[PDB]
Amino acid sequence: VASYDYLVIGGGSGGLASARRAAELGARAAVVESHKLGGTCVNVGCVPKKVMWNTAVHSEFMHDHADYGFPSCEGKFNWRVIKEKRDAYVSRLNAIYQNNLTKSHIEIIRGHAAFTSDPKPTIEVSGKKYTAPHILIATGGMPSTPHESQIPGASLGITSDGFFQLEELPGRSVIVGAGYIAVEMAGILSALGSKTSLMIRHDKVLRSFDSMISTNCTEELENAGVEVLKFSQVKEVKKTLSGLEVSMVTAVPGRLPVMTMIPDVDCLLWAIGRVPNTKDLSLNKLGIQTDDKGHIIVDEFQNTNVKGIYAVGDVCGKALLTPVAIAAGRKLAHRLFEYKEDSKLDYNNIPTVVFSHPPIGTVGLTEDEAIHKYGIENVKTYSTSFTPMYHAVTKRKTKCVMKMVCANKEEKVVGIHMQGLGCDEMLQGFAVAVKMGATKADFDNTVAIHPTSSEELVTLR
Amino acid sequence: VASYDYLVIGGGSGGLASARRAAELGARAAVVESHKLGGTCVNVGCVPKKVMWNTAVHSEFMHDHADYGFPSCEGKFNWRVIKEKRDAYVSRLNAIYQNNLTKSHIEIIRGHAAFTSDPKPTIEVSGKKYTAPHILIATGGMPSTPHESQIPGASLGITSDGFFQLEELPGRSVIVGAGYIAVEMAGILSALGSKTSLMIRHDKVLRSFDSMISTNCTEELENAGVEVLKFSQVKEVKKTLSGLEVSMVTAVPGRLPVMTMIPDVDCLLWAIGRVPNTKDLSLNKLGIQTDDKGHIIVDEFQNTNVKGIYAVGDVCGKALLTPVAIAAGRKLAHRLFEYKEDSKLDYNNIPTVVFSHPPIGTVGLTEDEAIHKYGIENVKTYSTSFTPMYHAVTKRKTKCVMKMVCANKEEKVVGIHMQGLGCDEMLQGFAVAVKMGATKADFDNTVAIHPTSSEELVTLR
Ligand SMILES: Cc1cc2nc3c(=O)[nH]c(=O)nc-3n(C[C@H](O)[C@H](O)[C@H](O)COP(=O)(O)OP(=O)(O)OC[C@H]3O[C@@H](n4cnc5c(N)ncnc54)[C@H](O)[C@@H]3O)c2cc1C
Ligand SMILES: Cc1cc2nc3c(=O)[nH]c(=O)nc-3n(C[C@H](O)[C@H](O)[C@H](O)COP(=O)(O)OP(=O)(O)OC[C@H]3O[C@@H](n4cnc5c(N)ncnc54)[C@H](O)[C@@H]3O)c2cc1C
Ligand SMILES: O=C(O)CCC1c2ccc(O)cc2Oc2cc(O)ccc21
């Protein structure tokens, strides 16, 4: 049994970040990874998605060339040109991450880890056993797919993983789901030319976001050509002579349900959820607590119910973002190896950007969450809706919506929600202000930068 | 003599903002304007400039279409298509501003105001006299041009005002000056296809900005095809059979001066400075203090040396920006009509964006200003330089540079300077944080938004 100071299971966002910071502090660390370093984000997540979003953005702005005095570009987009440069970029990142571990003297153990029945927590990878007084589980998650028993033919559809393997742009695509991944995929496929439908169980997408955002985002999707199929779900899928045929039931409240067949579908993409990667760890051997979905239960310090075993990232099922796994991973390294016992991540005020068209930026409480926490009488919101100056001269239009949620007499800014051009790069700084406890007066006393869309947030009345 | 509670001279950024806020507080106000409402910003400043910058941005990104899998767009940009839509937009804004004054019951007196010899401050506009216990001078400024005596033929060149009258893209252009207006004009003309030279007296542009920015900005200009002529100045200009011929002297320190003739110049644009609009006000009649350049001297509350007379905006010659004139104008209205005697603008930490390619964002102290204010031992800077993810797949590259200037033990963030894609919309929030007194730890404890360029500012080490 080879011993280390820190054993990290999973070489993704949280695992690499934690192992590297631990090493800086003097810990002899090893990272176990069965697949590719960089994990979900680098390989089939944030990075390849952003490159594809940058591609879709070019496609949208191209609609505006003639309005700006430029000649029209004839036609056909070539998916494989960008797909290949994208894959190459991911290969470059994998090599960089490997180099980063080696330069920090972190040992990389390749293979699938699983806990053993040994008394003191011990894992086995390819027949060999490894142990450490501190073991971090950062195995992340994976796309969820319907069971063939509940939806016959579900296995004919792909997940976001499959999206990154596509070598040609699908002609007709149906995305099922209403969360940010679904919205992003629908927006990229549609911008690039696929006849796209987004199937949702209710009437709006991103239902956990402030209502101004779910409402505005659903409308922008429709305005951009995405067919949003409301109150609908797949009953079954079948392979026809030319594509898939999707049977769906649409049950709009107050109407009779209606069954419809969507024919000649080239791509059915399930974007219904993520499931934690814990089934093959043999957690049961140590009695590590999980919820019924398989997520590992942890306290505020990322401790599991078993001493010397921690968990961070997607596997814990809360705030499924790369920077969250990274921040939690680092805070944990400081707690264990620098002895800062108060080192832990504050899960409040975590900012998020959804790469839709236009992008969405959000941090803090939605209006309803603030109303429930402070009381209707103590919540005041300020909002604005305008057409960015960029569209002053175009036939195509997008809107920019912003909402500021304030609480109490002092009007502490507890939430900022917005959608519009530039919102993706605009959020970080306001997130710093919100984390500091800014009030509306702090925003109001900051001189505006003109002409920008960002200045609207410091001049709300 | 018609009397009012508040008489504003100049219907531009600061004048309109001050008159409107005063009216909201109950003051019977009148605005004097001899030209077009909206002033410099709306008519020949911020607005038409931003539309032209948005146009140049399309031109630059077009270089990247083929890398992203799109077909190449053939050729010719048509200047007059956008020029006309731009003019129309400015007309729409002028009508909006007029409507805003009328709806607030602010009287608009058209014509040129000049003070009289009357004891109590009184102005005359087209033979009629007007007075008020509070008179605001917000006459702004105008482009500066060389005297024919110092530079024969200087009158053959145009200023930024003339830039907005151009109906065709000049084939060859020479911009003289090294401030932000010069840099912006050079960048738009070059992006749109003009063979452009930028003539500067030294070796770098924007010499008052942090050195990381002046250095990086000069290089980006050169990389983008702008010919930067260092240590050079115009000796004379003459009209030839086909364009202008510019004689310039280049005196690089440590070399002999050399005289050069730049022939076939279509457009010579002077971007050497701004001069305050005070010569025709008859300020001398009331003994209102001005400096030798004609700027009106004011204290921290915008008071002149004469009671009941104030000045805000460009005419005061400090922080020549639209939002500054607006903020000062409003703070003054609250002081006079709401009796908030502490109401005044803090001229520190005013943020600025230069619409270059890529754009520049800056707020606070440069490294040298911080070194002089706190002492070398008490200043720590953090910087980074990277190529944005957007260029991971392109042959063309731009850089993103960021610098954070911290002071004292706590590392109070006293300055943020950056240049790169997205920096124009990224600055506002960090400006709010800096105004609040954020330290490096506040930035460091804010969870990053991935993948963006903005996340680099919260992960500097
Ligand atoms: C389509 C998509 C787009 C996304 N876009 C964004 C975005 O733009 N911004 C953002 O912040 N977040 C985004 N996310 C979320 C982000 O990818 C995750 O939050 C993040 O990857 C979670 O990191 P992690 O360390 O928890 O796990 P992961 O990154 O998934 O890493 C877990 C690693 O552990 C390895 N592993 C698993 N089991 C074992 C085992 N038993 N033995 C050995 N190795 C094992 C896996 O191979 C994997 O490499 C996106 C996700 C998806 C799916
Ligand atoms: C090319 C250019 C680009 C710029 N871009 C930006 C930018 O992107 N962002 C930014 O913040 N700033 C920008 N600025 C600066 C900004 O335009 C000024 O800071 C702002 O206009 C100053 O406002 P003001 O109220 O002081 O004066 P002005 O806006 O100039 O208004 C003064 C008004 O008073 C009127 N007037 C003058 N004398 C009299 C008189 N005696 N009687 C009656 N009426 C009179 C004038 O006609 C004018 O309308 C730019 C300026 C220029 C030149
Ligand atoms: O297709 C084009 O010519 C414009 C591309 C483009 C763009 C254009 C104007 C503008 O004001 C902003 C802007 O932002 C982006 C951002 C991207 O990631 C890609 C293209 C752009």
Separation CA A400–CA A421 (nearest Å): 7
At a CB cut-off of 8 Å and minimum separation 6, what does A116 contact?
A: A122, A123, A124, A129, A282, A285
CB A279 within 8 A of CB A294: yes
| One domain, residues B16 and B96 | yes
**Measured from the CB, is residue B56 less than 6 Å from ligand 3?**
no
Please judge whether A442 and B457 are an interchain contact, meaning their C-beta atoms are less than 8 angstroms apart.
no
In which domain, by residue range, is B250 found?
144-272
In degrees and rounded to multiples of 5, residue B241 shows phi and psi of -60, -25
Place of tokens 């993520």: A274
Beta bridge partners of B142: B275
Inter-residue contact A161 to A31 (CB < 8 Å): no
Of A67, A424, A426, the CB nearest to B428: A426
Domain-terminating residue out of A318, A348, A378: A348
Token readout for A24 is: 């800086």
Distance B217 CA to ligand 3 centre (A): 20
Residues B8 and B118 in one domain: yes
Say yes or no: B139 and B156 in one domain.
Answer: no
Residue-wise over B365-396: b if at least 16 C-beta within 10 A, else e? Answer: bbbebbbeebeeeebebbeeeeebbbbbbbee
Q: In this structure, are strands A267-270 and A172-176 parallel, antiparallel, or unpaired?
A: parallel
Residue A211 burial by Cβ neighbours in a 10 Å radius (0-12, 13-18, 19+): middle
Cβ neighbour number for residue A235 with a 10 Å cutoff? 16
Contacts of A307 (CB under 8 A, 6+ apart): none
Q: What are the φ/ψ torsions at residue A86 (nearest 5 degrees)?
A: -70, -50
> Is A15 near ligand 1, meaning CB less than 6 Å away?
yes
Note whether B456 and B356 are same-domain residues: yes
Q: What's the DSSP call for residue A303?
A: B
Is residue B276 within 8 A of residue B10, CB to CB? The reply is no
Residue reference for tokens 């993948």: B451
* Among B73, B422, B447, beta carbon nearest to A425: B422
Map tokens 């002492």 to a residue: B375
* B261, B367: one domain: no
Cα gap B232→A433, rounded to integer Å: 45
* Domain end residue (candidates: B322, B348, B374): B348
Spatial contact of B288 and B309, defined as CB atoms under 8 Å apart: yes
Number of separate domains in chain B:
3
Show which of A348, A379, A401 is a domain's final residue: A348
User: Which residues fall within 8 angstroms of residue B109, CB to CB, at 6 or more apart?
Assistant: B30, B31, B32, B33, B125, B130
- What is the rounded CA–CA span in Å between residue A272 and residue A261? 20
Contact between chains at B51 and A393 (C-beta distance less than 8 A): yes
**DSSP-H helix ranges across A71-137:** 79-103
Query: What string of DSSP letters covers A321-373?
Result: -HHHHHHHHHHHHHHHHS--TT-----SS--EEE--SS-EEEEE--HHHHHHH
* 8 Å CB contact between A51 and A86: yes
Residue A301 C-alpha from the chain's centroid = 23
The residues, ordered by sequence, that sit 6+ positions from A179 with a Cβ below 8 Å of its Cβ are: A205, A206, A271, A273
B211 is in an annotated binding site: no
Closest CA to A18 of A430, A433, A315: A315
Alpha-carbon span A50 to A357, nearest angstrom: 12
Contact A428 B433 (CB under 8 A): no
What residues form DSSP beta bridges with B298?
none
Same domain, A5 and A139: yes
Q: Which residues pair with B388 in a beta bridge?
A: none
Q: Are residues A11 and A134 in the same domain?
A: yes
For A328, the token pair is 């939690």
| Residue A299 backbone zone (phi > 0: left; psi -120 to 50: alpha; other: beta) | beta
Min Cα–Cα distance to chain A from B116, Å: 35
Determination technique used: X-ray
DSSP sequence for B354-394: E--SS-EEEEE--HHHHHHHH-GGGEEEEEEEE--GGGGG-
DSSP state at residue B285: G
Instruction: List the CATH number of the domain containing B361.
Output: 3.30.390.30
Please name the residues in contact with A1: beta carbons below 8 A apart, sequence gap of 6 or more: A122, A129, A130, A131
Give contacts of B429 with chain A, Cβ < 8 Å. 426-433, 454, 457
Dist. CA B218–CA A321, nearest whole Å: 38
Question: Which residue type is seen at B319?
Answer: A
B426 and B370 in a common domain: yes
Question: Burial level of A128, CB count in 10 A (0-12/13-18/19+)?
Answer: exposed
Rounded Cα distance between A423 and B69, Å, is: 25
Residues B255 and B340 in one domain: no
Q: Are residues A136 and A223 in the same domain?
A: no
Start-to-end C-alpha separation, chain B: 65
Going by C-beta distance under 8 Å and a sequence separation of 6 or more, which residues neighbour residue A210? A362, A366, A367, A368, A403, A405, A415, A417
- The tokens 């590259």 sit on which residue? B397
CB B402 within 8 A of CB B417: yes
3-state class (DSSP) for residue B157? coil
Q: What CATH number has the domain bearing residue A187?
A: 3.50.50.60
Longest dimension (CA), chain B: 73
My answer on whether B170 and B231 are in the same domain is yes
Statement to judge: residues B296 and B204 lie in one domain? no
| Helical H segments across A194-340, by residue range | 211-223, 322-337
> Crossing angle for the helix pair A13-24 and A79-103, nearest 10 degrees?
30
Structure tokens at A361: 């930026």
Provide the pairing of β-strand A360-364 with A274-276: unpaired
Beta bridge partner(s), residue B380:
B406
User: Got the DSSP string for B392-448?
Assistant: GG-SS---EEEEEEEETTTTEEEEEEEESTTHHHHHHHHHHHHHHT-BHHHHHTSPP
